[PDB]
Design a protein around this ligand. Structure first.
Ligand SMILES: CCCCCCCCCCCCCCCCCC(=O)OC[C@H](COP(=O)([O-])OCC(O)COP(=O)([O-])OC[C@@H](COC(=O)CCCCCCCCCCCCCCCCC)OC(=O)CCCCCCCCCCCCCCCCC)OC(=O)CCCCCCCCCCCCCCCCC
Ligand SMILES: CCCCCCCCCCCCCCCCCC(=O)OC[C@H](COP(=O)([O-])OCC(O)COP(=O)([O-])OC[C@@H](COC(=O)CCCCCCCCCCCCCCCCC)OC(=O)CCCCCCCCCCCCCCCCC)OC(=O)CCCCCCCCCCCCCCCCC
Ligand SMILES: CCCCCCCCCCCCCCCCCC(=O)OC[C@H](COP(=O)(O)OCCN)OC(=O)CCCCCCCCCCCCCCCCC
Ligand SMILES: CCCCCCCCCCCCCCCCCC(=O)OC[C@H](COP(=O)(O)OCCN)OC(=O)CCCCCCCCCCCCCCCCC
Ligand SMILES: CCCCCCCCCCCCCCCCCC(=O)OC[C@H](COP(=O)(O)OCCN)OC(=O)CCCCCCCCCCCCCCCCC
Ligand SMILES: CCCCCCCCCCCCCCCCCC(=O)OC[C@H](COP(=O)(O)OCCN)OC(=O)CCCCCCCCCCCCCCCCC
Ligand SMILES: CCCCCCCCCCCCCCCCCC(=O)OC[C@H](COP(=O)(O)OCCN)OC(=O)CCCCCCCCCCCCCCCCC
Ligand SMILES: CCCCCCCCCCCC(=O)OC[C@H](COP(=O)(O)OCC[N+](C)(C)C)OC(=O)CCCCCCCCCCC
Ligand SMILES: CCCCCCCCCCCC(=O)OC[C@H](COP(=O)(O)OCC[N+](C)(C)C)OC(=O)CCCCCCCCCCC
Ligand SMILES: CCCCCCCCCCCC(=O)OC[C@H](COP(=O)(O)OCC[N+](C)(C)C)OC(=O)CCCCCCCCCCC
Ligand SMILES: CCCCCCCCCCCC(=O)OC[C@H](COP(=O)(O)OCC[N+](C)(C)C)OC(=O)CCCCCCCCCCC
Lengths: 506, 80, 60, 491, 192, 75
């Protein structure tokens, strides 16, 4: 469905005239395509049938219940992202027209979704190299979609070079495995899992660790996420981690067959450093996207602890954590895009320059959100308290399940460190909450006729005009309550995670 | 001499020199694949080698285009 | 009952280089694009192939 | 018929206040009638909600059996089992009683946003009350740390000049330490596949593993009582949080650590609790002695009250860790008595003096009995109650805790008797100064204690005297539940 | 697990389309008109521009129908495939399949049909197309070849089931049926 | 199952009600939105119940094999 509909959109977009309205309607067509793709995938793929694992296309691809769950998650999260570009986020032309300016926006997303879904399914070293480049190239194009932006082109240049080096490392690892064994199919390689250099697979993971911003390769990820536009950072900082982490879990599943203790220590060493940089790094920063980049690094480290353990509880921990983190990731960036309407207008010290690509760029731009919009502020507070890990929010159960897998497999040092890192990271998490609400009682009797929303003309002075459009506000409302009220259906959701099998069987 | 990271001096001090370094590094993996495939008398490895050449060519085109547009932006006033 | 249920699921059976799952259902080499009969080093007879290992479906 | 009714009614109560106050927020530039008189009709509804919460537990109290061993009112809700025994029943009643008292304390001394404050207070009261009726470690931890989110915002919004520092202290001190308690809980769920109270009490773990589990749990508890040297957050929070926040923190939150010892340490880690008892006594004795001496040098009026709570809860920790029924009952009696006297001292200091002069420095106040006789009467009476004078519930709790400590350890447990002298040293020095000498030259004559402040002081004084004179109201409920926590093999 | 009889592990493209139920065409039609409807629905939920409803241009309606037409067919194709795989109730499909196979066997014709592909290509084509419907939502791939790897035994078509005695079908041995692997390697073992 | 779907419909009303506060409109603004929101999550709730009911059957079948594996280990 994806491939066939992508070709039609490519031709149609180049035929019709260039306009913002047609691009937005074409974006809605892409939304229907992903929705149709989800319906088709759910019709034929079931958890019970895929438990054993089914080979496809001359065994080049292998789909199981573990892989199928992530693919369904990828399609769903992509649907929520397209809603941002398929509908209004602020209702203001000066702000929203950026999303409708580039026609190939929906085309590049559909290219990347194909790469994202097929990556966990790779069963050959040749197709592994092909798919990882297909996903990587699509991310470079999306980072450079705004080619009139100096920062966007600079970030894409940085993204291309770092990813290309990682691709070379991935290619170098697969070639070294072929030299030792002469086989390209992973299942054939598993026959010689006890006779190949298991550190060559560590070289493969090193290339994958670069693509997810893991330490010591964290620096480029933070720089790219902060410079890129908020609409672009929202995608490139979450989507690559959905597929690569799933593939890392499969590779670590194969590595644990021989159970190389030296391999675990090296990965533990990188996880330990990533928790230090992830926690202390965000303590002294002024940009919100820079803060979220450190937050992204820290949370990936938590998931890697579950991946490194690679046990039955790890499947439950990883599947739950990746789902709830994605929903929190979408909710936070959705709120950030909307709340740009409450920015004061100058009418200066520090000569602060704010561009149309990132209207919200500093943490202190979130000031007085408790007064400007109490419901949106609480929704952000719930999301932030979830990242902290306050129970009974979705974030607590994610860390609760990760700790179970870590301590069950004997990672006492990492479990204690991850909890110290959580407390350290709470400092900058609480700073967001301090900016939102701690000055409410002093600024309650204040006058703000210079906000961006105040420039919006009224219709007839009698219509009750909402400040936010129907779609984006509903998505925030739905995601916020799912995070808040997870205790109601927590037991059944984990039971669903009980049935996700990666060749466990019995 | 490799462990002191000697190759970091052989790379020039321009952005396009980094691109050349990546092409050489990827080319080394392809040469190794041809070396293993030829000894084994395995055409599967030669299929892999051909794919690596085609994929690496696509990577160069995408990177150059980003670098072309990056250079364009600075010299983009074009008032004349 | 809940404690008993979690003990069954959370137990990870031991894996080693002697017992693990490989997802291959057939022996390759029954047909080559050309020159199928090489040096006669292929001793696997597909006319008398013993039953392959079948994957276990715990839900069936 | 308890947790289901309590959560559903309060959730409906939260929704009701949100719908009414936030209906006209759509840049209407409106005036409305609910906001008249500082949102009186919205404060009144929230006050009624707190009163009804008390009636909910009273209906279950009528059916409570004091001669029945084990948890009563066992209920399944949200995939969680809830139950009540003798110890849980009394602590729930104290938490719900302080609900209306905390709301009434900030009736007309907030700069605004009364609806947000009322909802936050009621949410905290219910969450803390639910923490006494959960029947597993995971549910205990969920409610143990769920109160941080409403409390962090409450302090940061309605706090004093240093509210920002206080909000960081309470959020980080109580979370970084509770995470060490979560590690012990995770270990239980790994090796036993369950965190149920009854299930884990019957399991004997290795003496090394019990040592590791005890340390993880005690770190979360010791920070929350609090004990030295992890106590420095409490004086900052009390001196900056609003009066209603101080009442809940001093009256309920600090009692969760004592209840945590009852549930998480004594019946499941009994062997290692005996070994750790000398260490706990040494820490608590030094906590009692040091805090009393440190209180002598404090100049902030509300900080002095904050340190007084540390010394009293040190006695509670000493009593609850005694391996006899006298010490255990006395610790529980002192917790209930402290739950009334301690908020009253904050009300006298942070609610009566502060609401008139807005300065908490001690140098500005002396001779207050000249123009505030009603204030001085309550100040003197509550000062003697805080020092353990008989006829007050504090004396019954302190004497039995000291007696139980001597029975547990005659030599070093005798040092707990120093609380009789040390508590009177700092408490009376403050009271003697506030009432003695001529009226302060830095103060203008103003109103004495009003009717609203009289009501708060009287209905916090009444439970203290009733418990002090006839503590058998409390002992009868506790005797069967408390007898289960004793570990001894006499042959 | 709701399991049924296996019919064809790699059903042919024509076989899947022929075995469409009336509901399969119904879901195909709903997909064809659903996509234009969703564009109307999206405008009703939130207009693309302004605050009032505005019908999307007919050019958008034409391309949306084309997207829905392929989307509906793919959904119908997957539903019919599960009946061949046995994942779905297929008693109607089993009866129709058995009648066609017995008729072909009675004529000494291969049920799979004659193929232009040599023995290697027939096996190769089956490997590429088998279980490819699991990724049909990602990209298309269909079995458009007459190969002999369908994961079934033609012996099970010799036993007579209920309601098939009146079919009056005479079945010769498999070694006398044209275009079968058991009836091709007569002279050489490496050439059919 | 009606009580289950009633709860899901109640959740849908909550989402719509929370949306009204986000958009700064009275909670009576366009009352038909609550009908749409409630029926949307009722459809999700109906699918969710089927997902959980199906999951319970699958778990029981797997548990039987796990107990057999445990018996061999405990011997
Ligand atoms: C034939 C003409 C055609 O069907 O497309 C209409 C379209 C009309 O051109 P136009 O008159 O300039 O457009 C004026 C309006 O914009 C026309 O506006 P429009 O909205 O009517 O056209 C947009 C069109 C969208 O156009 C497409 O999606 C065509 C994609 C084909 C690839 O959507 C449709 O109209 C749907 C029906 C036509 C497409 C059906 C194709 C089914 C897939 C096969 O013609 C093309 O798109 C030409 C693209 C193909 C050129 C030939 C390529 C042949 C390649 C194989 C050669 C070897 C054999
Ligand atoms: C990331 C991107 C990934 C890549 C994605 C790009 C796309 C790749 C996937 C493309 C599709 C997969 C195909 C890959 C290459 C396969 C090449 C191949 O195997 O050719 C062998 C094939 C020879 O193998 P064979 O064993 O002799 O089988 C002969 C017939 O194919 C079998 O005879 P029959 O019984 O099926 O019926 C013969 C006659 C129909 O006459 C009849 O008697 C059928 C009776 C029932 C009629 C039901 C109508 C159903 C059709 C509506 O015509 C047909 O219906 C042939 C079926 C194909 C229909 C058109 C294909 C639609 C696909 C969209 O060469 C062909 O001529 C195939 C003709 C089909 C048209 C080309 C198919 C590709 C378009
Ligand atoms: C759009 C939401 C559609 C939900 C569809 C969930 C889904 O894909 O199916 C559940 C899937 C497992 O499904 P499976 O076991 O293979 O088959 C049985 C299905 N009954 O399990 C999964 O893998 C799904 C994991 C992702 C769960 C996402 C939960 C919903 C996300 C919030 C939706 C917000 C809706 C916002 C509405 C915007 C429009 C106004
Ligand atoms: C009772 C309650 C207790 C609660 C708290 C318990 C923990 C207490 C921790 C005590 C240690 C920190 C307090 C003392 C540090 C003071 C730092 C300082 O004074 O300056 C920073 C110092 C350089 O000194 P300078 O900048 O010149 O300052 C002037 C000094 N005359 O910079 C330095 O030289 C420091 C050394 C370099 C940095 C080392 C970092 C390595 C990792 C440190 C541990 C972090 C562990 C984090 C684990 C999770 C993340 C992995
Ligand atoms: C405001 C005031 C607050 C309180 C101030 C401090 C007072 C409380 C602490 C002081 C001790 C109280 C009384 C404890 C001693 C009572 C026990 C006793 O009778 O002493 C003798 C007894 C030995 O008995 P015996 O029969 O001889 O042993 C034979 C073993 N085969 O046992 C002994 O050997 C005596 C034990 C050693 C003496 C310990 C006393 C020093 C405590 C110092 C505390 C720090 C100052
Ligand atoms: C055959 C492919 C083209 C379909 C032609 C039928 C069609 O599009 O009808 C025209 C109509 C547009 O209406 P209108 O532009 O106002 O009429 C001309 C005014 N001078 O079109 C419409 O009203 C839009 C309704 C959908 C039109 C059919 C869309 C399906 C096109 C065939 C898809 C096949 C796959
Ligand atoms: C009328 C239709 C309402 C829904 C009816 C229903 O079946 O929902 C289940 C439950 C009713 O109870 P029941 O089915 O008998 O089983 C106990 C599970 N609570 O009803 C419910 O469970 C609804 C509970 C909603 C309130 C839960 C919100 C949690 C509050 C924060 C957590 C605090 C404690 C941790
Ligand atoms: C027991 C389960 C309860 C969970 C749900 C509670 C309600 C959530 C808020 C939705 C309604 C809303 O945001 O409404 C806002 C209300 C009403 O305040 P107001 O003064 O009228 O608003 C100002 C508007 N003026 C100025 C025009 C009057 O205030 C609240 O935020 C109170 C509830 C939240 C307290 C704790 C926040 C952090 C929660 C973290 C959870 C771990
Ligand atoms: C095992 C029991 C653990 C108990 C809790 C541990 C200590 C908590 C300290 C509170 C910090 C706070 O409140 O963060 C806020 C304070 C603000 O400092 P301030 O008060 O404004 O003064 C200082 C500012 N100046 C100089 C401008 C006046 O920023 C910090 O310090 C940031 C670092 C906090 C990291 C805490 C991580 C703890 C890791 C887990 C334990 C090893
Ligand atoms: C201004 C607003 C402030 C906040 C107010 C909050 C009010 C809450 C409304 C009452 C809800 C109610 O009644 O829920 C009850 C219903 C029906 O439960 P059931 O079908 O028996 O499920 C079994 C319940 N057990 C296990 C407790 C027995 O559950 C629901 O629909 C759940 C709503 C979804 C919660 C999000 C987690 C699941 C996400 C799934 C996809 C990832
Ligand atoms: C069978 C399952 C689906 C439910 C059936 C209804 C579908 C929606 C079509 C109705 C028309 C419509 O949505 O109209 C748009 C309306 C109204 O928006 P407004 O801001 O008032 O528009 C302003 C118009 N004035 C000026 C007249 C006031 O939006 C809504 O009510 C938003 C809620 C969407 C429906 C609930 C979806 C729940 C999905 C969650 C599950 C995962």
């Amino acid at each position: 469905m994806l491939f066939t509909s992508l070709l039609l959109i490519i031709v149609y977009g180049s035929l019709v005239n260039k306009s913002h309205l047609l691009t937005k309607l074409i974006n809605r067509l892409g939304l229907i395509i992903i929705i149709y793709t989800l319906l088709i995938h759910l019709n034929i793929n079931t958890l019970e049938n895929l438990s054993i694992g089914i080979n496809m296309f001359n065994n080049l691809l292998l789909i199981n219940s573990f892989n199928n769950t992530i693919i369904e998650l990828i399609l769903i999260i992509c649907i929520l992202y397209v809603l941002l570009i398929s509908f209004n986020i602020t209702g203001l032309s000066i702000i929203d027209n950026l999303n409708y300016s580039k026609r190939t926006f929906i085309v590049i997303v559909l290219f990347n979704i194909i790469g994202l879904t097929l990556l966990p399914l790779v069963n050959d070293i040749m197709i592994l190299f092909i798919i990882i480049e297909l996903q990587s190239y699509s991310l470079y194009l999306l980072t450079a979609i705004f080619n009139e932006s100096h920062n966007s082109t600079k970030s894409a240049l940085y993204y291309f070079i770092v990813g290309s080096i990682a691709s070379f490392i991935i290619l170098d690892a697969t070639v070294s495995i072929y030299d030792d064994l002469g086989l390209t199919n992973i299942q054939y390689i598993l026959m010689y899992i006890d006779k190949l250099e298991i550190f060559d697979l560590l070289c493969l993971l090193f290339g994958l660790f670069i693509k997810i911003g893991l330490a010591p390769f964290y620096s480029y990820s933070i720089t790219i996420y902060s410079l890129s536009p908020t609409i672009i950072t929202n995608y490139i900082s979450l989507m690559p981690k959905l597929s690569i982490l799933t593939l890392i879990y499969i590779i670590m599943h194969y590595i644990n067959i021989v159970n190389n203790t030296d391999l675990n220590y090296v990965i533990s060493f990188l996880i330990l450093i990533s928790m230090f940089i992830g926690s202390f790094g965000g303590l002294n920063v002024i940009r919100i996207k820079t803060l979220l980049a450190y937050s992204s690094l820290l949370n990936v480290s938590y998931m890697l602890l579950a991946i490194l353990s690679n046990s039955n509880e790890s499947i439950i921990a990883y599947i739950y954590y990746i789902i709830q983190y994605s929903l929190t990731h979408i909710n936070i960036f959705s709120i950030i895009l909307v709340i740009s309407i409450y920015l004061p207008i100058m009418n200066n010290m520090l000569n602060v320059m704010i561009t149309k690509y990132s209207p919200i760029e500093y943490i202190n731009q979130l000031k007085n959100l408790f007064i400007n919009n109490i419901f949106i502020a609480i929704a952000l507070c719930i999301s932030i308290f979830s990242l902290i890990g306050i129970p009974p929010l979705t974030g607590f159960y994610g860390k609760y399940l990760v700790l179970i897998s870590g301590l069950n497999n004997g990672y006492v040092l990492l479990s204690i460190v991850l909890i110290i890192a959580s407390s350290i990271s709470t400092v900058y998490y609480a700073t967001i909450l301090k900016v939102l609400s701690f000055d409410t009682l002093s600024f309650k009797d204040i006058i703000s006729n210079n906000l961006i929303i105040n420039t919006s003309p009224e219709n007839n002075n009698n219509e009750i005009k909402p400040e936010i459009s129907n779609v984006i506000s509903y998505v925030i409302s739905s995601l916020t309550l799912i995070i808040l009220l997870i205790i109601i259906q927590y037991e059944n959701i984990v039971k669903g995670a009980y049935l996700v099998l990666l060749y466990n069987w019995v | 001499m490799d462990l002191i990271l000697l190759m970091l001096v052989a790379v020039g001090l321009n952005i396009i020199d980094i691109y050349i370094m990546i092409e050489i590094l990827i080319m080394g993996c392809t040469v190794n694949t041809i070396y293993s495939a030829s000894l084994d008398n395995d055409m599967i490895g030669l299929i892999y080698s051909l794919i690596q050449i085609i994929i690496a060519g696509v990577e160069s085109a995408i990177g150059l285009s980003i670098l072309v547009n990056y250079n364009r932006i600075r010299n983009s006033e074009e008032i004349e | 009952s809940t404690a008993d249920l979690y003990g069954l699921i959370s137990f990870t059976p031991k894996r080693d280089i002697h017992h693990y799952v490989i997802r291959v259902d057939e022996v390759p080499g029954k047909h080559f694009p050309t020159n199928t009969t090489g040096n006669f080093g292929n001793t696997v007879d597909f006319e008398n192939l013993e039953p392959r290992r079948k994957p276990i479906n715990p839900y069936l | 018929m308890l947790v289901q009714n309590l959560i559903i009614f309060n959730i409906i109560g939260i929704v009701l206040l949100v719908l009414l106050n936030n209906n006209n927020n759509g840049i209407l530039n409106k005036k409305s009638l609910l906001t008249i008189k500082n949102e009186l009709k919205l404060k009144q509804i929230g006050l009624i909600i707190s009163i009804i919460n008390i009636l909910i537990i009273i209906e279950n109290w009528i059916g409570f059996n004091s001669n029945y061993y084990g948890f009563q009112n066992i209920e399944r809700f949200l995939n969680i089992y809830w139950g009540i025994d003798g110890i849980s029943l009394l602590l729930v009643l104290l938490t719900l009683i302080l609900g209306p008292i905390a709301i009434l304390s900030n009736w007309k001394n907030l700069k605004g946003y009364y609806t947000y404050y009322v909802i936050s207070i009621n949410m905290l009261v219910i969450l803390m009350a639910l923490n006494f009726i959960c029947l597993d470690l995971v549910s205990f931890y969920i409610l143990f740390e769920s109160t941080l989110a409403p409390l962090f915002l409450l302090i940061g919004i309605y706090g004093a000049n240093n509210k920002n520092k206080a909000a960081y202290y309470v959020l980080i001190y109580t979370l970084a330490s509770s995470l060490f308690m979560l590690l012990s809980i995770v270990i239980y769920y790994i090796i036993i596949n369950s965190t149920d109270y009854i299930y884990i009490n019957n399991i004997i773990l290795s003496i090394n593993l019990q040592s590791l589990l005890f340390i993880g749990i005690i770190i979360g508890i010791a920070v929350k009582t609090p004990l030295m040297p992890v106590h420095t957050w409490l004086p900052t929070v009390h001196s900056e949080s609003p009066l209603g926040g101080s009442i809940l923190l001093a009256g309920v939150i600090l009692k969760l650590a004592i209840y945590g010892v009852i549930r998480l340490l004594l019946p499941n880690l009994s062997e290692i609790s005996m070994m750790f008892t000398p260490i706990i006594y040494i820490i608590s004795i030094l906590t009692l002695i040091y805090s009393s001496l440190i209180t002598l040098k404090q100049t902030d009026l509300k900080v002095i009250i904050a340190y007084s709570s540390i010394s009293h809860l040190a006695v509670c920790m000493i009593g609850i860790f005694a391996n006899n029924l006298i010490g255990i009952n006395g610790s529980l009696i002192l917790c209930l008595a402290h739950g009334f006297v301690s908020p009253a001292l904050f009300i006298l200091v942070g609610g009566i003096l502060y609401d008139r002069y807005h300065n908490r420095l001690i140098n500005y106040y002396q001779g207050l009995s000249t123009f505030m006789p009603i204030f001085s009467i309550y100040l003197v009476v509550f000062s003697f109650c805080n020092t353990g004078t008989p006829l007050s519930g504090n004396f019954v709790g302190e004497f039995l805790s000291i007696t139980g400590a001597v029975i547990r350890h005659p030599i070093i447990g005798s040092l707990t008797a120093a609380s009789v002298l040390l508590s009177a040293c700092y408490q009376m020095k403050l009271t003697n100064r506030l009432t003695g000498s001529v009226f302060s030259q830095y103060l203008h004559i103003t109103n004495d204690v009003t009717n609203r402040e009289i009501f708060l002081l009287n209905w916090l004084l009444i439970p203290t005297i009733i418990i002090g004179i006839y503590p058998s109201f409390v002992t009868n409920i506790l005797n069967l539940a408390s007898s289960t926590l004793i570990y001894s093999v006499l042959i | 697990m709701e399991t049924y009889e296996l019919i064809d592990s790699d059903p042919k493209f024509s076989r899947v389309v022929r075995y469409f139920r009336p509901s399969d065409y119904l879901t195909w039609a709903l997909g064809t008109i659903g996509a234009p409807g969703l564009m109307v629905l999206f405008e009703k939920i939130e207009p693309a521009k302004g605050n009032t409803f505005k019908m999307p241009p007919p050019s958008i309606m034409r391309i949306a129908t084309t997207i829905g037409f392929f989307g509906g067919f793919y959904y119908a194709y997957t539903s019919s495939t599960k009946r061949f795989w046995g994942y779905s109730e297929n008693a109607k499909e089993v009866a129709k399949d058995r009648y066609e196979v017995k008729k072909a066997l009675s004529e000494k014709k291969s049920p799979y049909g004659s193929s232009l592909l040599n023995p290697y290509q027939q096996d190769m084509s089956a490997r590429n197309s088998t279980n490819s419907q699991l990724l049909l939502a990602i990209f298309p791939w269909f079995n458009v070849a007459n190969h002999q790897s369908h994961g079934i035994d033609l012996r099970k078509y010799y036993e007579v089931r209920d309601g098939e005695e009146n079919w009056n079908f005479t079945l010769p041995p498999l070694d006398q049926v044209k275009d079968l692997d058991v009836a091709q390697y007569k002279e050489y073992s490496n050439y059919p | 199952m009606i009580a289950s779907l009633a709860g899901w419909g109640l959740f849908g009303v909550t989402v719509r009600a929370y949306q009204q506060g986000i958009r700064k409109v009275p909670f009576s603004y366009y009352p038909l939105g609550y009908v749409y929101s409630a029926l949307g999550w009722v459809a999700f709730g109906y699918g969710f119940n089927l997902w959980t009911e199906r999951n319970d059957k699958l778990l029981e079948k797997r548990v039987e094999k796990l107990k057999e594996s445990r018996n061999l280990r405990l011997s």
